[PDB]
Amino acid sequence: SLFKIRMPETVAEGTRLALRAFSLVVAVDEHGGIGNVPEDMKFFRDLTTKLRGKNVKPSPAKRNAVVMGRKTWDSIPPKFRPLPGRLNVVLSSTLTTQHLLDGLPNLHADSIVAVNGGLEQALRLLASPNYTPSIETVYCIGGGSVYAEALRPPCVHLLQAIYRTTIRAVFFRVPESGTEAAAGIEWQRETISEELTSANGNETKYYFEKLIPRNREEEQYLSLVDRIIREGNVKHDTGVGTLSIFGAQMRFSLRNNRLPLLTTKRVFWRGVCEELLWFLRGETYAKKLSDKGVHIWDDNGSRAFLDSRGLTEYEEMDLGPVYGFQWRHFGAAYTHHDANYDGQGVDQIKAIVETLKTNPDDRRMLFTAWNPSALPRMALPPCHLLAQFYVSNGELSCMLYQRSCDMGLGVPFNIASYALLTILIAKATGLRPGELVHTLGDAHVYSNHVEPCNEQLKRVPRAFPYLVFRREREFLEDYEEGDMEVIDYAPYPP
Amino acid sequence: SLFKIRMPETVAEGTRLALRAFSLVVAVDEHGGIGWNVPEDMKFFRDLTTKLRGKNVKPSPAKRNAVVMGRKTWDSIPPKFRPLPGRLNVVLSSTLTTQHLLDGLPLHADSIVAVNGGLEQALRLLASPNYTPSIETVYCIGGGSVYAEALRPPCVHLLQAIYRTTIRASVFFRVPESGTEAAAGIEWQRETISEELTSANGNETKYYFEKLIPRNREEEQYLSLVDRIIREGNVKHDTGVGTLSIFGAQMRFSLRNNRLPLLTTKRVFWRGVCEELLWFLRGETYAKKLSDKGVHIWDDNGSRAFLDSRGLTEYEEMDLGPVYGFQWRHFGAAYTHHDANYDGQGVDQIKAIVETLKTNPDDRRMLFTAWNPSALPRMALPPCHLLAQFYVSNGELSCMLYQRSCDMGLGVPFNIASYALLTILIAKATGLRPGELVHTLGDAHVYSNHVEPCNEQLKRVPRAFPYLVFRREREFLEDYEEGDMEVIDYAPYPP
Numbered sequence: 001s002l003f004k005i006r007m008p009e010t011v012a013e014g015t016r017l018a019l020r021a022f023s024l025v026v027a028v029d030e031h032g033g034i035g036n037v038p039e040d041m042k043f044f045r046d047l048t049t050k051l052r053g054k055n056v057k058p059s060p061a062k063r064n065a066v067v068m069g070r071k072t073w074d075s076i077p078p079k080f081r082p083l084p085g086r087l088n089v090v091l092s093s094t095l096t097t098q099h100l101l102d103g104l105p106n107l108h109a110d111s112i113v114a115v116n117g118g119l120e121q122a123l124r125l126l127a128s129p130n131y132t133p134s135i136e137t138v139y140c141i142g143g144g145s146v147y148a149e150a151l152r153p154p155c156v157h158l159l160q161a162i163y164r165t166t167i168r169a170v171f172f173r174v175p176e177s178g179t180e181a182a183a184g185i186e187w188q189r190e191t192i193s194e195e196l197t198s199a200n201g202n203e204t205k206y207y208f209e210k211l212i213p214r215n216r217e218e219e220q221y222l223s224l225v226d227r228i229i230r231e232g233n234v235k236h237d238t239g240v241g242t243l244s245i246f247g248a249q250m251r252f253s254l255r256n257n258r259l260p261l262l263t264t265k266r267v268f269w270r271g272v273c274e275e276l277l278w279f280l281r282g283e284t285y286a287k288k289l290s291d292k293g294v295h296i297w298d299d300n301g302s303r304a305f306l307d308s309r310g311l312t313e314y315e316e317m318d319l320g321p322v323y324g325f326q327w328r329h330f331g332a333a334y335t336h337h338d339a340n341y342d343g344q345g346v347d348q349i350k351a352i353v354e355t356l357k358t359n360p361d362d363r364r365m366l367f368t369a370w371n372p373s374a375l376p377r378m379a380l381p382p383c384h385l386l387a388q389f390y391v392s393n394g395e396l397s398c399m400l401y402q403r404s405c406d407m408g409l410g411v412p413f414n415i416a417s418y419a420l421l422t423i424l425i426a427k428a429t430g431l432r433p434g435e436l437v438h439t440l441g442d443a444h445v446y447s448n449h450v451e452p453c454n455e456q457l458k459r460v461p462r463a464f465p466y467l468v469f470r471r472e473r474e475f476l477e478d479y480e481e482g483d484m485e486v487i488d489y490a491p492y493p494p
Numbered sequence: 495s496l497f498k499i500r501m502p503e504t505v506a507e508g509t510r511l512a513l514r515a516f517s518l519v520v521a522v523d524e525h526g527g528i529g530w531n532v533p534e535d536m537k538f539f540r541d542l543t544t545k546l547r548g549k550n551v552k553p554s555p556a557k558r559n560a561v562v563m564g565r566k567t568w569d570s571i572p573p574k575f576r577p578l579p580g581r582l583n584v585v586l587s588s589t590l591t592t593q594h595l596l597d598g599l600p601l602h603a604d605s606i607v608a609v610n611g612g613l614e615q616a617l618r619l620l621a622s623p624n625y626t627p628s629i630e631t632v633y634c635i636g637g638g639s640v641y642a643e644a645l646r647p648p649c650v651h652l653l654q655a656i657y658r659t660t661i662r663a664s665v666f667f668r669v670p671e672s673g674t675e676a677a678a679g680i681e682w683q684r685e686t687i688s689e690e691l692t693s694a695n696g697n698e699t700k701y702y703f704e705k706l707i708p709r710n711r712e713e714e715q716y717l718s719l720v721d722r723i724i725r726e727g728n729v730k731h732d733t734g735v736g737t738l739s740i741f742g743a744q745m746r747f748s749l750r751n752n753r754l755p756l757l758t759t760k761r762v763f764w765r766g767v768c769e770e771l772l773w774f775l776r777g778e779t780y781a782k783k784l785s786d787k788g789v790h791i792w793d794d795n796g797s798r799a800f801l802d803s804r805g806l807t808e809y810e811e812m813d814l815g816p817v818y819g820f821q822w823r824h825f826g827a828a829y830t831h832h833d834a835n836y837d838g839q840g841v842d843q844i845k846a847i848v849e850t851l852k853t854n855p856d857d858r859r860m861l862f863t864a865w866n867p868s869a870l871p872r873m874a875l876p877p878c879h880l881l882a883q884f885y886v887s888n889g890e891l892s893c894m895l896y897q898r899s900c901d902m903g904l905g906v907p908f909n910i911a912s913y914a915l916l917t918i919l920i921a922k923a924t925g926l927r928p929g930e931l932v933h934t935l936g937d938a939h940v941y942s943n944h945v946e947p948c949n950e951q952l953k954r955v956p957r958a959f960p961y962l963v964f965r966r967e968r969e970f971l972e973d974y975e976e977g978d979m980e981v982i983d984y985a986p987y988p989p
């Protein structure tokens with residue numbers, strides 16, 4: 001219909017996943033050389049086989065993948081060939097899938113694939129819809145030529161984690177920080193075990209490490225939470241205490257499918273996405289969200305809360321002309337939720353989408369919910385209250401201004417919410433997703449969240465996950481939470 | 495008038511200047527000792543302390559400099575030169591009254607004043623309405639005990655420049671070193687240092703000059719961004735006009751203890767800043783009110799041809815429609831023409847925030863905006879500084895501005911000064927002291943043609959900011975005028 005935003009033909013193009021991300025698992029000697037420790041084989045099997053979910057039996061619907069060179073495949077004892085419970089992807093210029101099957105002594109057909117190519121070719125195959133998102137983690141298991149390719153671009157930028165066992169008994173060398181070979185990645189240890197002793201009868205000495213690429217973007221957030229606790233002003237309102245500072249700014253890359261969902265505490269993505277779509281549709285009835293099991297508006301849509309605003313005539317969960325209402329119908333007269341507001345008010349989102357397509361250098365491509373005429377008719381004044389877009393080199397960037405920032409729960413939710421908005425607007429306009437800039441006004445931690453924030457500040461952030469689209473829609477307003485999926489999200493535990 | 499904002503009777507309090515700023519002039523030996531016969535150094539001293547900065551006009555009681563000196567330095571000045579001529583002479587003494595100093599002369603009663611106290615007491619005097627703004631620069635000329643007071647808090651935070659002459663020829667002049675406790679957070683750096691010079695004194699004495707200034711990290715933030723836009727911004731051309739740009743940035747400026755962040759590496763048109771800001775706060779929309787004060791910044795956007803190009807064929811010339819201040823004091827009101835009676839129409843966001851600040855300063859919704867999509871097409875030009883939010887802590891008011899399009903050459907310094915002035919005014923309206931300005935930038939750009947003079951500006955090391963004082967006050971916020979306030983100690987570099 002005429003009021004919706006039609007997606008262009010290029011809709012899938014700038015979000016298509018080029019290479020699937022992966023982790024590396026390697027054992028080396030004390031000099032880093034890669035040429036019988038059962039505890040290491042126990043760790044290898046568990047780390048490469050188990051899914052992150054509670055009690056999930058690996059199957060073609062949901063399992064890990066192991067990627068290896070043809071010589072590593074040859075050297076697996078035939079008892080464990082193919083590695084059971086994993087997809088086995090084997091790199092070879094010589095051997096087809098059929099030849100690998102012919103080397104066994106039909107059970108295994110869905111679990112073995114040959115790739116005539118290197119690790120990059122294997123990551124390109126694993127990014128296709130038959131394997132993403134069904135493969136949960138891709139593990140690269142060598143050998144030396146495959147590790148070399150994993151540790152240089154373009155593959156190295158998709159390496160989430162390196163699991164290295166060192167055993168006191170061609171070198172595996174992680175690029176050093178600041179060096180050309182590192183390509184701007186700063187490798188750091190998340191964990192390193194004590195020196196351990198094998199029960200193998202030889203008293204073999206070994207230790208494990210897990211390295212991860214330093215995530216300076218989530219570090220920004222961490223630094224700000226640490227500063228608010230160490231130096232923020234205490235205020236009490238009802239008497240709820242907060243610690244606060246005023247004025248800050250963070251930036252996050254959305255390029256090549258990255259999604260900045262924080263890793264040091266899990267973000268409720270399903271909630272982020274349902275809510276953002278609800279904003280984009282211009283919705284105002286919060287029951288639409290609570291009926292999908294997203295309860296973030298229940299406190300502010302209650303009879304009691306609405307009455308406390310003077311909104312006595314609103315039905316329960318009708319929030320008035322909040323948010324998406326102003327995005328799609330700024331200044332329209334509001335009566336009740338779900339009336340026909342087609343063509344009323346200013347549709348700021350449609351207008352920006354049209355400008356992005358025809359004049360992407362325009363400096364007025366902004367939208368707002370802060371409408372002081374409508375403020376008193378809203379359950380709450382918007383907190384994320386405007387955003388502005390910018391284009392460079394065919395990439396779309398967005399800056400968000402947020403007046404009141406709960407660092408514990410609101411801010412990580414809003415980062416994700418605006419990352420997703422930017423990605424969707426780039427898909428609507430022929431552009432690739434660029435950077436998200438988040439400006440913060442009053443940035444606060446509730447005083448009862450101080451000890452848990454301190455516990456969270458103990459954690460070293462991990463690589464962010466990625467966003468892919470399983471399918472597309474003819475109109476921007478018809479997107480659904482099931483159309484897209486977050487892959488490679490590995491947050492720390494609660 | 496019921497629609498205006500009445501100033502509280504604390505209006506003058508949070509803005510009264512406590513101590514007047516000053517600069518220091520000293521001669522030392524190669525060891526830093528202060529104990530000479532170098533006529534070029536006397537000439538320097540005489541010219542620096544006597545001359546005014548604009549027109550080289552005769553100093554008089556309406557406009558001159560001051561010299562501040564301890565009693566023994568006064569005793570040491572040769573009677574041909576006592577008191578110094580063309581300067582107000584301020585003498586620190588627990589023992590000598592002004593009359594006792596007059597008695598020790600062999601016309602001068604308005605040019606000599608004794609202060610029973612130290613440098614801090616002299617700077618409090620010099621801050622009073624009889625001496626600020628009429629004294630253009632205050633110079634501290636020693637001796638040891640007065641220099642030691644100049645170089646520690648509280649006086650050192652008011653020290654704008656140290657002019658040291660060193661001469662190859664007891665007590666030591668030592669400027670606190672960077673990062674030390676004695677430095678109190680200030681980083682002294684050389685703006686200039688001469689080559690080694692030889693005196694025409696009969697002895698070929700060797701000497702040289704330095705001028706030291708307190709590093710101004712706030713203005714450096716701006717210059718760093720200008721440098722980054724030129725070295726790394728994206729080139730774009732619009733009608734063919736070129737810019738270099740980046741997206742998303744943020745700067746912060748202290749407004750504390752009368753400081754005013756008017757940039758020093760290129761002079762800002764303060765009078766135009768002030769006139770326009772007051773014009774916004776009154777809710778005005780006629781640009782002729784400004785061009786009739788010689789502030790022409792809206793002339794291009796208010797022309798007949800320009801209005802016609804936006805479709806605004808029924809608006810008389812210079813009527814901008816419901817821009818800026820009109821949304822600040824009348825958000826959402828229907829606009830007909832400039833100067834109609836809009837009282838009580840639309841939302842008065844400035845009034846509302848003033849009442850919230852007085853009663854619930856912790857509120858997190860004290861924001862105003864001019865970005866009104868319904869009214870955008872009636873405006874001559876959508877606002878560029880479009881919203882601001884206030885925050886209070888420790889009795890201090892801070893403000894953050896959001897600006898969508900940021901011309902770093904001319905616009906940005908102008909709007910830093912604009913929102914610094916707004917914040918100071920709103921603090922005076924609400925019983926608060928001015929705190930900090932936070933400036934958030936969207937599309938931040940340098941026009942292609944300004945690259946070379948921006949690069950000439952980046953050669954300059956920023957100097958300490960000036961200060962804002964209020965000569966008088968008003969009953970209503972809307973009645974303030976540019977002549978009610980004065981910028982003092984502004985010493986920008988040349989064009």
Ligand SMILES: NC(=O)c1ccc[n+]([C@@H]2O[C@H](COP(=O)([O-])OP(=O)(O)OC[C@H]3O[C@@H](n4cnc5c(N)ncnc54)[C@H](OP(=O)(O)O)[C@@H]3O)[C@@H](O)[C@H]2O)c1
Pocket residue numbers: 025026027028033034035068069070071072073075091092093094095115116117118119141142143144145146
């Ligand atoms: N400590 C450890 O964790 C560790 C690590 C690595 C290796 N190892 C040991 O070393 C041995 C593995 O040897 P390796 O490291 O020499 O070899 P590998 O890397 O496992 O296998 C190399 C083979 O992989 C295929 N391959 C690699 N890149 C390719 C590309 N771009 N295109 C097509 N095919 C490609 C080629 O097979 P085709 O010849 O069929 O084309 C190549 O000969 C094993 O016996 C193992 O025990 C141990």
Ligand SMILES: NC(=O)c1ccc[n+]([C@@H]2O[C@H](COP(=O)([O-])OP(=O)(O)OC[C@H]3O[C@@H](n4cnc5c(N)ncnc54)[C@H](OP(=O)(O)O)[C@@H]3O)[C@@H](O)[C@H]2O)c1
Pocket residue numbers: 519520521522528529563564565566567568570586587588589590609610611612613635636637638639640
């Ligand atoms: N090369 C140079 O630049 C340079 C620099 C400094 C000095 N000098 C020379 O060194 C001599 C200066 O002597 P100095 O440095 O020992 O003296 P000074 O600082 O010039 O004078 C000290 C006198 O100032 C008054 N004073 C200072 N602080 C005071 C306070 N808090 N309250 C009240 N009164 C205060 C007192 O006068 P009462 O005794 O009347 O109470 C005190 O005795 C002169 O001969 C001068 O020409 C040269």
Ligand SMILES: Nc1nc2c(c(=O)[nH]1)N[C@@H](CNc1ccc(C(=O)N[C@@H](CCC(=O)O)C(=O)O)cc1)CN2
Pocket residue numbers: 025026027040041042044045072075076077080083084141142165
């Ligand atoms: N960290 C770790 N990483 C590694 C190796 C290691 O040595 N340890 N060695 C290389 C991989 N080589 C093999 C060899 C044999 C098997 C194998 O056969 N594994 C069975 C378990 C067999 C068993 O329990 O002994 C499995 O089910 O995973 C797996 C990888 C590269 N990466």
Ligand SMILES: Nc1nc2c(c(=O)[nH]1)N[C@@H](CNc1ccc(C(=O)N[C@@H](CCC(=O)O)C(=O)O)cc1)CN2
Pocket residue numbers: 519520521530535536537538539540567570571572575578579635636659
């Ligand atoms: N840099 C510089 N700074 C200084 C001194 C200096 O030594 N040079 N010396 C101390 C000031 N002492 C004096 C002593 C005498 C005079 C004096 O008499 N000046 C006449 C000019 C005299 C002349 O031209 O011969 C005048 O009108 O300024 C000025 C400062 C502290 N500051």
Ligand SMILES: O=c1ccn([C@H]2C[C@H](O)[C@@H](COP(=O)(O)O)O2)c(=O)[nH]1
Pocket residue numbers: 380383384404405406407409410411414444858
């Ligand atoms: O998207 C949002 C909305 C709200 N908040 C937080 C900010 C405040 O701590 C609180 C709302 O209180 P006020 O700012 O409205 O008073 O919720 C967020 O973090 N994110």
Ligand SMILES: O=c1ccn([C@H]2C[C@H](O)[C@@H](COP(=O)(O)O)O2)c(=O)[nH]1
Pocket residue numbers: 363878879899900901902904905906909
């Ligand atoms: O307060 C203001 C108003 C305007 N501009 C500059 C920004 C742009 O260079 C130009 C406005 O052009 P658009 O952004 O509206 O296209 O003027 C400023 O820097 N500050």
